[PDB]
């Protein structure tokens, strides 16, 4: 088989035969930030290093054209003082663009073209400085890494709650900080064929969770049990305990989206429960206690379940009794 | 004496820019680096962003592409451009080694031009695959800058009385031409494929084929280089090892050569009787404009074949002469210029030039093979359609018997149209053999004089011998087949019935004359075998005789100076590349008469 | 593949097979020496058997004679092993069980008795002889470069490794292409065989368009197999030529360096380049 | 005709006869970032270049008033050392404001006014540096360019699904990264006249899509089919196949809004399907397949449709049978 979403939230889909490369070229910045860190470091390094080299040749060339490279006598004021070779020009380019300015190699007022290049390099230097420094901070401050500290259960549980079967799972937050405006979306991913004969390979049917005022809103500070009540209009209304084997083509996806309180950027944590990762005769064990004047959450027992008496019939059969 | 772009002579007086900057040789050479760094700084950000950024989960494969107008010309010019720059780098290094200091301006600008020229090809190909005609402006700017900055250097040579005697003057002149023509090509695509200036971006007109028709034979669609290296097949073979191939992975045939489009032109040419003479006129008209292309590649490959021995002759003479004295004897502006004669004097230069000469030769002969074969099987499909059409409708009032002869028709499309196809496989080979032979013997005569004439004559006289034993070998199999058929017929009387023949226990005496029926065929095998063994030592051992009749003849009847290693190996190399193109000459003559019978057989059976 | 080829030496015996190995190896070794002495003689020509160097010619005169006898030594033995294979199969055919013959299709035996033996007789000894001289000459050509310059062999081995991979990927693909070309050959001529008989049952009854177009399906399947087989060969040769051309440049550059690095060599270098 | 929204999401509306230019003047920063790139480069260049010139005249003037420009003798400590002409003053302004500081031209402690200008230039130099560099990064990191990699179908489909006619379309995401909190809004744009006689030239009627838990929420990692079920209260309840010609005045708009996971800025992808761009008797072909242990999406067959047996009657007539 294959997993639509990995247990860690990675999506196992490969996009193939794209014939619209122009769209990717028209969207450059998103490409720049989406690069892996070894490529981001290379681009960050090569953006400044090539910029210094490009103007280093310009500084070297105009010093050549002005006769500054020739050591013949003196009495001539160079475009840039103390420039002898390309290495001097390259060092001067670094001083100007990074705004170090040692002053041993200084621009003089003899060559208006040199003053023109000094204006151009500073303007170009600022734009490269602005984009690249901002780009690498966006790369660092991405909110998807915050999703690594949002943990779901390794197993999902279907059991009787208030007389109806409920597909339950537990989601917790390890960090002290909060997830502002957290929303939970649960979907069923399987191949469904309509009566007209249309087949959808990964038809994602959105299932609701019981919240009391609708859904898609939680206050995640202690590990919550997120459960969906299986009723007449639920896609799992005809799910039997015999169906919960490895090769079933039945996947449940849980999505947790919210604004990271520490950073301010919305994140997304995903997980998936295959058919064999759902336990029928089980129930989660409480892990919240009260020590002194502060509730203590025991994350060691996060995913533990305890068998409970549950009917081996489908939710359809339960209504029919 | 550290690294210096302009070299450290006098008091670095070569860096002075008085009397004009453009009159300073180094500055103009430095000015020529501007276009090359421009191309690198433009294409690399573009190539990385659109092509080298997303990977391993985002596939942007284009299984459809249209070549820009002038695609073939652009690749030809770049290959010439790449070759000339290699000469310019080699020319610069020879001039630089004489001085005590290293003048980087002699070769580094040309060396960096080599990277930019390659990058332009890489940049163009990726753009061309994914359209993006607007991005061709970067090349358009690059060619204009390169043309401007190379014109300046060429003009300043003319001002400084630098004639054609100096090689660097010639190489710079060619680059102006090559940059100029490439500039025109970029202008050409703007006219044909208006995309920037005109307000009507003319329709790309996507190819009729190359859609999702299952075409896997991408040879007529890939770029020019991939046509000469078959790089498209590399991916196909890379997976053929993992999975066995089938008639589905092999795909469908391209539209231009399926079967019908070959026959459609065949019957069109037939419009002009339908005799043997009339058949050849149609085939020449239908499949001649492509056949000459294969011969032309073969001719050029044959011409570059002599570049092997010539480089061998050149390298040894300038290596065994010792001396090791190198002096350009031509110094302008304090810079040494090497003459054309002196440039083709260094062993390293000859070795590099030989390496480039082989690559063009090896590719050309391979290109000659495929075009002939592709055209050969194109005729085979058209001929089979004509043969089948002859048997089928439009053949009213069949003469008599069982459609003339059932057996004759079966082999007519089995082992008679193949001979016609194999004639076109070797059609350039017969044409290109005399050209290689006449130049080969002439070059031998200019190396070893009289002794080479005798050695070449006996090899030429071997060609009738090879055909003579070919007729004997062919006749031996013909006599063998008469006895083998009787042996097969006698054996195939209860062999298929051996499931029930063995039950009667009559096979004990049946398998007693098998040796007799085989010895009557083995004695014909002996006649066939001895002819084969005769051709072996008349082919494998004949180069040894050719060498001896040329070597010992230098004093037996020539009486000349002692032979040098250069003249000996050059003639040895010429003999080696001449003996091998002789077996095909006997084969093509045998194939020529065989095909002539087959086409006559088809012509007489056409009506 | 070729693992079962360790057998078949019984037909060639021991004395006969060893004679071919000794003769074939001798011819290539002498030719190496013949060219080697030519280089030394030419080197000695420009300045002790320097007198008219007929000894080297005499050594060259025996090689062709030794090559002449080798041509028939490997050819005469090939005929006898065909006789022994013919004799061995005949004894098995007579003693072949009838029940096994009934169970088997009994048609493959007839094809193996006639078609396979015919290929073994007139083709295999020639192909094996050509293979032996080619696979030995390259090794000899891979030693003269070592003699002219022991420095070239440092990078020669990695190039041969790349040659091994290219060859390994070609034989697998080419043979499968050969099968498909053989596979598509049968329907094309069989349809023509079905065309010559019952044509009046096709012309009168049917429009004949389907049958003619059905052939185009056969020809296209045949043509694609042919050019794909051709393209694989052209793919193989080109990568082989580029490896060979690269070898020349490495050999030439190394040989030139030795002469200019006071390593003598002189005209001996020109021998290796050829 | 005219299109309310182009196929690429461009809105074809021109605002005319605006007599409230004071509102645009009161909102300057949004104007600054909304400029096209050639204007943004000009403003970015002219903001620094004019700043250097403005203080260059000030540095030149106070050096004039102090007598520094006069080469008469020495023994006088200038306001700024080594200032001779306006070019020297202009170079000094660049050194101070870009914080290069070569040191050949250095502020001295003789002129308190010169020290005052040095304080003023640095404070002004920082504000211009802060606003302009931040402005050009916002211009680069705009989320609208991310919408260029959110492809929609070139044709919509109205087929039979589960016994009811459904207006279907396919939306996909080319990038590997996700669109967090993706929402889909579909609207019908046509001229509707109320019974009272009021006419609305572009009355945008919002239509719902079937999601199962309400709507306006998708998990877009694989190309989804977004469809609206045509029922009694739907605006297309009286749509006939004869009405799907070019000159019909019936436009469907699809809006996809979500936070870009890579960047963190909400984006918006728009598309429109005119009457003739909607195919009646069609159905999208599945493109999602399973290769090894990873689903493969074949974007070559993205917009392809296959004819299916569909009634040629309106959804109103379907209920009436
Ligand atoms: C006597 C001598 C003594 C010598 C002693 C030696 C002395 C050695 C001297 C100095 C250097 C040691 C410096 C110490 C520096 C720390 C830098 C701090 C900034 C920094 O953060 O850099 C770090 C460290 O790497 C570097 O150092 C990269 C730093 C940039 C390198 C720029 C070099 C410029 C190259 C120019 C050279 C060529 C110039 C040519 C010159 C000629 C031109 C004419 C980058 O590391 P990282 O942790 O951010 O990246 C990982 C990694 O890339 C993973 O692939 C990535 O996985 P994914 O993103 O999920 O795919 C991880 O992501 P997760 O967070 O999810 O795990 C990242 O966390
Ligand atoms: C011997 C000598 C040798 C000489 C050799 C030559 C040597 C030449 C020397 C040095 C320069 C070459 C520098 C190489 C630089 C790259 C800069 C990198 C920063 C950068 O990103 O700049 C780039 C390149 O343009 C520039 O270069 C613009 C750079 C800023 C220019 C500032 C110049 C300052 C003017 C002051 C002069 C006047 C001063 C007066 C002085 C006297 C005062 C007293 C801007 O290009 P872009 O790609 O961002 O802009 C496009 C374009 O604008 C499209 O219109 C836009 O369409 P929409 O936005 O949709 O409307 C595209 O948007 P999409 O993304 O959707 O497609 C943009 O992508
Ligand atoms: C003295 C020597 C001077 C050497 C330096 C030269 C300094 C001089 C400086 C700059 C000028 C030389 C400029 C090159 C000139 C002309 C290019 C004009 C072509 C152009 O417009 O560029 C874009 C690509 O966008 C980029 O990637 C553009 C990306 C930026 C391009 C410039 C790269 C900037 C970084 C380079 C500097 C690197 C510095 C360090 C890196 C800094 C990083 C911040 C065209 O490409 P496209 O793919 O967008 O257009 C296609 C194509 O045209 C289709 O036919 C068309 O139809 P459909 O595909 O069916 O829809 C579509 O057209 P649309 O674009 O309208 O949708 C697009 O699909
Ligand atoms: C002395 C010798 C003198 C003469 C020498 C002549 C050598 C000429 C070599 C020129 C090679 C350029 C050929 C075009 C390369 C090119 O286009 O690469 C492009 C390739 C990707 O392939 P694709 O077909 O686009 O793939 C389809 C895929 N679906 C896609 O669109 O993606 O992916 C790439 O982008 C690959 C880039 C590789 C660039 C390598 C350049 C050459 C390197 C140096 C070798 C030559 C110099 C040797 C000196 C000795
Ligand atoms: C490494 C060396 C690279 C060498 C590249 C050689 C390429 C082989 C040539 C080759 O295969 O051409 C074959 C092509 C294909 O013709 P077609 O099917 O009719 O297609 C065009 C279209 N249908 C039309 O005719 O409309 O035929 C054509 O379309 C025309 C081909 C013309 C080829 C001319 C070759 C000259 C090369 C000169 C190079 C000299 C310098 C080389 C130095 C570098 C060496 C490394
Ligand atoms: C370098 C490899 C880059 C590459 O693989 O280039 C890929 C292209 C393939 O040809 P194509 O784009 O026409 O095929 C259509 C694909 N859409 O170019 C070539 O292979 C030209 C041949 C490369 C030269 C190699 C010669 C030495 C080895
Ligand atoms: C400079 O070098 C040149 C050699 O090209 C020669 O005229 C002399 O050695 C030097 N002349 C002067 C004036 O320095
Ligand atoms: K300083
Ligand atoms: K600073
Ligand atoms: K500073
Ligand atoms: K200082």
Numbering used by the authors:
A (entry chain A), D (entry chain B): 32 to 352
B (entry chain E): 1 to 272, 281 to 615
C (entry chain E): 997 to 1043, 1060 to 1286
What did the study's authors say about this model?
ATP-sensitive potassium (KATP) channels, composed of four pore-lining Kir6.2 subunits and four regulatory sulfonylurea receptor 1 (SUR1) subunits, control insulin secretion in pancreatic β-cells. KATP channel opening is stimulated by PIP2 and inhibited by ATP. Mutations that increase channel opening by PIP2 reduce ATP inhibition and cause neonatal diabetes. In addition to adenine nucleotides-dependent regulation, membrane phosphoinositides participate in the gating activation of KATP channels, as they do all other eukaryotic Kir channels.
